Amino acid sequence: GSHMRLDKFIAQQLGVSRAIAGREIRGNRVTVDGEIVRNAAFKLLPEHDVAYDGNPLAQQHGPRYFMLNKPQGYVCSTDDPDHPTVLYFLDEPVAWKLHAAGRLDIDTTGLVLMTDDGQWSHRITSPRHHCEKTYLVTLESPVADDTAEQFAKGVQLHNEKDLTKPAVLEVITPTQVRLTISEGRYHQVKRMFAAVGNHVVELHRERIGGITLDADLAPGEYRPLTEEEIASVV
Ligand SMILES: O=c1cc[nH]c(=O)[nH]1
Secondary structure, three states: OOOEEHHHHHHHHHOOOHHHHHHHHOOOOEEEOOEEOOOOOOEEOOOOOEEEOOEEOOOOOOOOEEEEEEOOOOEOOOOOOOOOEHHHHOOOOOHHHOEEOOOOOOOOEEEEEEEOOHHHHHHHHOOOOOOOEEEEEEEOOOOOOOHHHHHHHOOOOOOOOOOOOOOEEEEEEOOEEEEEEOOOOOOHHHHHHHHOOOOEEEEEEEEEOOEEOOOOOOOOOEEEOOHHHHHOOO
16 A cells, blocks of 8 residues: 655654654644644545645655566667557556667577666666576577677777677577676667677576576566665666
8 A cells, every 4th residue: 555654744844853844743833634634643544635834845756667578570769660668568657758768679588687677777777787697599500619808808899899798608508508697788789799790689687787588477477676676677
């Protein structure tokens, strides 16, 4: 249930201690739905209209954060009108207000963080921030023996002045590798492999900073992030 004591809401709104919020409430300065409320423990609901000295104090919908296992065939923005967006999978009120804190291309699958918290989102996506992202990459040809070292030194993408920052590549099978990078350049993973002479056949994101995609969240499924995960997805 979404609810909070009136004295806590007033404290928050006026930037005052809960004790003084109580003082004000008993001072007959606080109204809810037009009537005066002198009780500090009043259970404030989302549908209540609070006012302080005649002035309205709208309540604020808390921020929302979701973990989505993105499937192929859907896009993470309305930039391209030829494909349906990932909102198709979300069944949440005013879902159009949500955006991906780190977009994935149409056929790239995996972890996408849906949120309406711009600050949180920016801390994660900013090109200036070192945020690690790990991908499960399926290759056209068996990985070369020098690729891991290449990625460690950093490679040069086709027509880019500066190399890619050091990334670590773990070989699972000859054609399936796990790659961790800390950048966010456009189509970086696919271009890094093109640069060294291979081709990405399938791309799956498993982690973003401190948040790892659940092993049992099926493609298309999603869920609210826990307080711990929100607390620091890196
Ligand atoms: O990091 C990313 C995301 C999408 N495509 C890539 O090649 N790399």
